[PDB]
């Protein structure tokens, strides 16, 4: 919001960008680990289970 950047000594944008990017990375690695097939890539654990 616009009433937070003024409502703080220091900016909070770099933190926001970093958190978004690292959220993407963590989610993708977790999904490739054990993501199911429903709307998500099949994970190696799931693939080994079904085989």
């Amino acid at each position: 919001t616009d009433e937070t950047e003024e409502d703080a000594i220091f900016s909070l944008l770099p933190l926001l960008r970093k958190r978004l990017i690292e959220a993407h990375a963590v989610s993708i690695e977790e999904a490739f680990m054990t993501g199911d097939g429903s709307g998500k890539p099949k994970g190696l654990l799931t693939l080994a289970s079904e085989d």
């Binding site: 003024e6 409502d7 703080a8 000594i9």
Partner: protein, 43 residues
């Protein structure tokens, strides 16, 4: 008018509309900007 032998269709040709706006007397601003203002840069 509707008194002569010839008449107009409706009042919109009996009437003239003015494009000027008028306003009444309104309350004055007194306490709004008499104290001096303190600038801020945080909560």
């Amino acid at each position: 008018n509707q008194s002569s032998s010839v008449e107009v269709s409706s009042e919109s040709y009996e009437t003239i509309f003015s494009q000027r706006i008028i306003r009444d007397l309104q309350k004055e601003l007194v306490v709004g900007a008499l104290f001096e203002e303190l600038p801020m840069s945080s909560k």
